[model samples]
Target chain A: KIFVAILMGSDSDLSTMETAFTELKSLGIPFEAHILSAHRTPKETVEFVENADNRGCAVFIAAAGLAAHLAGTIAAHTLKPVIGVPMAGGSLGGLDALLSTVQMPGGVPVACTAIGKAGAKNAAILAAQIIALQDKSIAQKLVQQRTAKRETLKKADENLQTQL
Target chain B: IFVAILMGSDSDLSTMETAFTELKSLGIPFEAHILSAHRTPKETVEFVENADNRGCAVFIAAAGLAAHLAGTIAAHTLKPVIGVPMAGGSLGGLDALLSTVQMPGGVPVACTAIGKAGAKNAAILAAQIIALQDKSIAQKLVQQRTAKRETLKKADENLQTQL
Candidate 1:
């Protein structure tokens, strides 16, 4: 079976990246998470990428803050789609990490998402979207998810009308 | 006399190009350059300090994750610094947004929205800042404001029709 591999730059990212974990679980997708820093453990990250690729991991999701290069690092080693979730860090919050992760050097690409929780959630959805191209069950789940989101917006509009 | 736009990397040009277009639409003369806070901190500082002495009135720094270009520029000049966070890296440009928007006390970088949205707003904000001194530019802004309102009105009308 295909699985998604989630790599975090540090355990610090756990609080934020867990949103991706929760999201993937809710989607009924199998995934594994790990803490692997790009700067600190460059070799380890490369090794894990190679190993995960061989382990039927269809997509890789990397989350980090500050000078976040984890997702890009993963992309460098794998042709499979990589999703980046930049966590907010330091005095500037997550913006620093977001730029570091999103600005790829051209041909290499990491499907980037919003910072923190939102990005984490989106990363799971995006990863699922990629895997869904081959899996019909996942595709159906996505359609239901989209419909649910629309219903949420409609309910919000109804609440606004009632308040007015 | 002009605006100085600095990009942390040449890769930023794609997103920061929106600022150039917006500034041109406002008839604002602006200069742009590729400079990095991490790669060439010395040159970035030199250019910012010199630009202040030159005809530059405001600075817009565009960069991706760990986006320190704006804050670094703000450190060098007392002039208003605008930050446009490019959506290049992971985290959907949120990392850039936080890095650009969050500043230490006293040193301020006026941050706009993320990526292209922020880039467009930076130019508009710069124009607004400049318009404080130039009445003609102020008048142009008012006209643009009315046009924007009209566009929104049209959008609302279209939405109602569809409903």
Candidate 2:
């Protein structure tokens, strides 16, 4: 019941999505990554979202760019939260991708991250946070991750002197 | 081998200065043009076409920190286009940011941070993409990053000394 689903618009998005895959793996969370498009493979995308929801997929992380609609499409099908990583490239780049992902309707919302690599990594962490809401073990891992991230930031700050 | 920069008005140059400055320091060639997206629609389009024909890898448009200019540029060129939100207007920061960012599918703009930071980041990102295609730029990109890291390292040393 604590699993996450990741849907990508294209295989080209795979490299950017590796950040999410690796982050989820590190957090010890179960997740599945797929190459699905909201426009091109609309019906199958809906079908897969239906199955994932039925199968107790707790959250979904979708990555895409251009006229990205994978996240929006998933959110429309499932009531669960869908975290979107607006991918970084295309004829137009991530500009259209981020807007397409983030600008959702009132009820159906696709939670968004920055753009590109950072967005991909944060989507995984955000999914973990959602899963943690009902699971204490996952909550502990979230806190630990926070602690580690904080330490790294502090260490980097301390190292700033050397940078000067 | 050159980056194209367009701003809505003369005042935009101040905000856009950071991007050109960064591009120059990084050894990227560029030209900054002040033109209105609305005033000379036909004229702007011609310039974009000209720039595209002349080996411009990326285009940076500061359009009142909104759509129109940036979005238009993306529509014209298959190349990457960057948008910088100059500053918040009546609606504040997110206003122009969203305006410039919200684009249709086929035509996309690589939106950057708002104001001066956004301008500079647009150049940085453009350079990064250019570096992917050009070996010389790629080498400079890595060198700049290392130098930036060194700056941080030096700052850390100062912090330790203060402590």
Candidate 3:
């Protein structure tokens, strides 16, 4: 099974990362979770990223709460697409994480998602989309997923109408 | 049943209205006003301090560029402040969201996405927070959250099951 590397700067982020984990599992997307700090475990972080491509990983999910550079760093070291999920922390929660991930200085790019759970889920979906870009099977799967989303919304609208 | 919908600028009403739209759909009573953090600090402060007194169940504040409205309201009032960071500012709305979501110690605002739909989510989140203390509201909010979950779930169910 293809895997998405789910790495976080700290173990405390599990609360937020749980959203990504559940979303991925529900989608049948297999991912290996890790706690690797770019600022603290610089060497290991770099190594994990450097070897990610060869390690049978297709996508990488990196989350950090404050001053988040994990996503940008992973993108810098590897060729695979990196999705940054900014975990809300402290007073600002995950706002700082969002800026750090999106406001990257030129030369490196990491596709950022909304703050917290939505961001993580979007990262997974975005990664799947990226993978689908090259794989016909995955692409079709993504399209079907989108179609189902529309259908479900239609049903909700119907139910809402009845309730109203 | 009362919600305060405030924006940092009159311009934000355009996007923040989506929040009102959603709140009205849920049969929630709400009040919306425009008072920029940069232009009318006093009004903003007064508005925040008196929101709960005026029977507001939740506060939704939206601002574009250097968004501090959320933090300010959170500081002045003990009620939950839901922030919507509007885009149109120089830094591509990141500035507004960062400043709005990143509050100092003790004061916290639940930050949502960067644009229009985010404002709508802010209203939904406010409903969730309000439901915490009220069972009936909680049931209504649970329905809302369930709808969101189903939306995401369908995204997976329809997938071709690859990747």
Q: Provide the TM-score, chain A, model 2.
A: 0.92
Task: Rank by DockQ, highest first.
Answer: 3, 1, 2
Clash totals, every prediction: 27, 20, 6
TM-score of 1: 0.52
The candidates' DockQ values read: 0.02, 0.02, 0.03
True contacts kept of 3: 0.00
Cα lDDT for residue A110, model 1? 90
The residue-level lDDT of candidate 1 at B119 comes to: 86
> Which sections of candidate 3 miss by over 4 Å?
B1-163
Instruction: Rank candidates by TM-score, best first.
Output: 2, 1, 3
Best by lDDT: 1
Q: How would you encode candidate 2's per-residue C-alpha lDDT over B95-156 as one tens digit per residue?
A: 77677755543234656656776676677666655654466875776676677669979999
In model 2, which regions exceed 4 Å deviation?
A: A1-164
lDDT computed for candidate 1:
0.85
Candidate 1 lDDT tens digits, A27-139: 89999888899999999989999999998989999998888889988998999889998887676767788789899988999988887786889899999999899999999
The true-structure Cα RMSD of candidate 2 reads 21.4
lDDT of 1 by residue, B112-161 (tens): 88878888999999999999999988998899989999999999999999
> What is the C-alpha lDDT profile of model 3 across A1-164, one tens digit per residue?
57789999999988878888887776667788889999999999998877777878998899898799899889989877788888867676566777889997777778788777667778888877776666787777777776675455445434433432
Ranking of all candidate structures by their lDDT, best first: 1, 3, 2
